Assembly symmetry: D2
């Protein structure tokens, strides 16, 4: 519930299904520790990444594997991935949705942050 | 169910709440006939605009009143509105989501079209 | 020089070349009167639309013929066109650039207003 | 000339001026080595990053320091930075422009790859 990812396809006008997403958290030593991962559903959504307990304050990186998606539709895209890096939960727990809209040579991302 | 509008605020990182939306349909005489209207909810969504019966084939215009939103947050924006114009249901009934992401000097829009 | 339009293609990663663009000014009776038009260049730009003398405060609509663009590339598009509607205000900077980034089911637009 | 970066501000409708940009090339051991950097100009552009000789095929990362930008304007931002990661491929056009459109909780990026 606290971290959700939504991915849309701007070419097809559809959810981007079966998109791999990897989440990292910056460790004390400044390396990126694996935090969670998953694949978007048939609605382009990925829930279930983490729990309120696990999702502590920190700097998080959400890596959306856009290059496998375009190639596994038969398209050679420009970007390797879309990376979204942000500090989370630094004034207490929030719920974050990271949304991404994909084209072969472009993407946009936005965050929706709500306080439960 | 067949036509939904979702509006997000890129400054606040939130749904864009209480955004007025007007939908028009192009008439035989090439004028824009009022079709439906409403306001986004606290989740930035507007459902209930039309029914499968009412939502026939045609050219539709979804006008999102972005200028009242920015001003009624105390911001003077650039655009008068965001207009999304498209042919609908021309190969049979589809479900359309029109999404818009707003900034004072910019917006983006995408469509998600699904076949029930 | 006061009004320029820049159009980009998010599918091919290129300027959107030979796109028709029509500019309208809102008239007293709430109708849209033709103001300027042209086709984007090889760099996706359209210059020469108006002059400082002609470009007075008011409500303008920039209609980009995205459907013809995508059709000419063999790609099925969603929108009839992209329309960007804005007020020109003399209290703000002098030169307006209307930029649009096109995909078949999506577009993005922004204004760069500079002195 | 082969690599340019353009940054725009969607809140103010202007170029994003004096934004720090760092470019990295991926090394054999999967680490990111510094390649080029600078600050955007008054037109939101950064030229002069590299030369044709230096800019070989590979994986590049363009990190835009969006958080400092927004802080200097007094605006609370979401992202630490914006990172654009791509492969340079010689089979495609010669000149790369990486464009980014910034908002406090969102950004858009596109590539314009031309000859
Ligand atoms: C939290 C975002 O959730 C959504 C949920 C349902 C449908 C769409 C979205 C969504 N739309 C956009 C959007 C992307 C590009 N241009 C305009 C809008 N980003 O996310
Ligand atoms: C003001 C002229 O604009 C430009 C001039 C030169 C090159 C590129 C651009 C440009 N990039 C974008 C853009 C839009 C949405 N997401 C990312 C980028 N819009 O315009």
């Amino acid at each position: 519930c606290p971290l959700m990812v939504k991915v849309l396809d701007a070419v097809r006008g559809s959810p981007a299904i079966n998109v791999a997403v990897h989440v990292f958290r910056k460790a004390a030593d400044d390396t990126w520790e694996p935090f969670a991962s998953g694949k978007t559903s048939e609605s382009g959504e990925l829930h279930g990444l983490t729990t309120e307990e696990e999702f502590v304050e920190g700097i998080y990186k959400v890596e959306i594997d856009t290059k496998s998606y375009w190639k596994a539709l038969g398209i050679s895209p420009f970007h390797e991935h879309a990376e979204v890096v942000f500090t989370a939960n630094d004034s207490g727990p929030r719920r974050y949705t990271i949304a991404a809209l994909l084209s072969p040579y472009s993407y946009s991302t936005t965050a929706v942050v709500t306080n439960p």
